[PDB]
């Protein structure tokens, strides 16, 4: 809902003690990039976790390689860095037709 912000003004949603289901969320997703830093991509919706913090933003697939922590570009410099000590995931999706 609404305009997704940019990668440096990423919109934070913290989820705790609520039910989430990616199968009802990924069913409307034309996901292009599906990677997960320091954790598996497939079992992200499977296991139970204490907290899930999800920052969503507008991010093209043309700038995809700056998403990683090991990247030295602008995104890992000044825009958004993911957690080293916590499991992390980078998903770039496209709007379905």
């Amino acid at each position: 809902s609404g305009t997704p912000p940019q990668v440096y003004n990423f919109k934070r949603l913290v989820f705790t003690n609520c039910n989430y289901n990616l199968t009802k969320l990924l069913s409307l997703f034309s996901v292009n990039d599906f990677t997960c830093s320091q954790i598996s991509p497939a079992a992200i919706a499977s296991n139970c976790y204490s907290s899930l913090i999800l920052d969503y933003f507008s991010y093209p697939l043309s700038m995809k390689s700056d998403l990683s922590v090991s990247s030295a570009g602008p995104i890992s410099q000044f825009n958004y860095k993911q957690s080293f000590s916590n499991p992390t995931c980078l998903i770039l999706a496209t709007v379905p037709h």
């Binding site: 954790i39 598996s40 079992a43 499977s46 296991n47 976790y49 499991p87």
Partner: protein, 49 residues
């Protein structure tokens, strides 16, 4: 007044050891037994650098 025994390069131990399965979201615990060895030693060399 003794030279038959020698000293190691430097002391070393393990500060983190557990198992991860194929799903890679849940951690399987590891515990040492009475003067035993966890399998984390199996990949650690003779001395940690």
């Amino acid at each position: 007044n003794l030279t038959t025994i020698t000293k190691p390069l430097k002391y070393s131990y393990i500060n983190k050891c557990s198992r991860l399965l194929s799903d890679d979201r849940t951690e399987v615990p590891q515990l040492v037994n009475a003067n035993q060895y966890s399998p984390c030693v199996s990949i650690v060399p003779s001395t940690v650098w």
